[model samples]
Target: GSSGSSGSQGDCSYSRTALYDLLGVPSTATQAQIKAAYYRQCFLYHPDRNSGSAEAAERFTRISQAYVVLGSATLRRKYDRGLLSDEDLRGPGSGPSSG
Candidate 1:
């Protein structure tokens, strides 16, 4: 019998500053500080350890996505300036028919 898993939730529309808040860093934090904060958060919500908790999984995903933008110099700059949309933050393959 196929046990149906629940569908993933839709993306939450996060404010531009929310990503920084997610990582627990101020907008003016340096790359090193941001990296430290991301790892700290990752430790708390890592899916490998939090496997059975749906909330932990969601937090892990958000934390990782936060790093994807904040960890990059170029992307971080664009993000800081409010140039990135929610779709943009969803990263490369998330686009519509990028073939």
Candidate 2:
């Protein structure tokens, strides 16, 4: 073994299963199930309902993000097969050095 000073932090790798857990649904959940759960979470965490609450706003955004992948058949397929990443889901401008 040899020590390397060239080590550097890499991109944040969010777990693929996080979407499922965040939506409170199982990996086997159907689109209908996921949709229902996402709606419920949205209702509870909607920004309007939790005025000035940074936490609720963040949770709401996350829940919406999870739904974006889990609610679509094409995206869900890619997500299930480990073909997607946080940057992919978050779209452009989310790179390590993005300003």
Candidate 3:
């Protein structure tokens, strides 16, 4: 999912919230729980496997970002406290950054 082209790699719009929303869950969800969800979904997604119509590439990206943020104690706390949002996750200009 890190090549070069429109479908080469996934775009950055893939938000962590997107994945949770797909499963009707929350950002504070657990890795094990999310993993189970991903496994179940991969069957219907997984580019190399499925790719019928489900946007699996986008899903993968969202999950990765979620783990990147929530997996970190500092980021997780800031996120739970409402100090972070999709804006911050998108990029620097999206919102205030550490200057």
Candidate 4:
């Protein structure tokens, strides 16, 4: 796997893509940490690995988008300053419990 910036991840309304949450890293994570998180996410979500399920494909794409944005110092700075706004969900959704 290539080591560097580039990615997205899953969850919410059945679907959410918070860049940090997607990568499973703290917002304050460093470049190295971001890259590592991204790699792990990819391995788990790459469509090929998951039999090309639509969900997996979608997740992989989001991961790529997150990495592209976060990997760039300029883009990341803009995001940090609130120049960008995104509403994304992380993790699986739990339906209401049956009593």
Which has the greatest lDDT? 2
TM-score of candidate 3 relative to the true fold:
0.41
- Judged by whole-model lDDT over C-alpha atoms, candidate 1 comes out at 0.78
Candidate 2 error regions (>4 Å): 1-13, 92-99
TM-score winner among the candidates? 2
Candidate 1's residue-wise lDDT over 22-98, tens digit each? 88898888999999998899777665777599888777777788788878888887766778666766555655765
TM-score of every model? 0.68, 0.69, 0.41, 0.59
lDDT at residue 95 of model 4 (Cα atoms): 83
| Residue 15, model 1: Cα distance from true site in angstroms | 0.4
Candidate 4 C-alpha error for residue 89, in Å: 18
The lDDT, on a scale of 0 to 1, for candidate 4 is: 0.71
How would the candidate models be sorted by lDDT, starting from the highest?
2, 1, 4, 3
lDDT against the true structure, each candidate: 0.78, 0.80, 0.61, 0.71
- Ranking according to TM-score, highest score first: 2, 1, 4, 3
Runs of candidate 4 exceeding 4 Å displacement = 1-17, 84-99
The residue pairs that clash in candidate 3, if any, are none
How far is 18's C-alpha from truth in model 4 (Å)?
Answer: 0.9
Tens-digit lDDT string for candidate 2 (1-99): 678767775567856578898988998888888989998987776666786887787777778888888778888888767786767676776559656
* Candidate 3 minimal-lDDT segment of 10 residues: 14-23
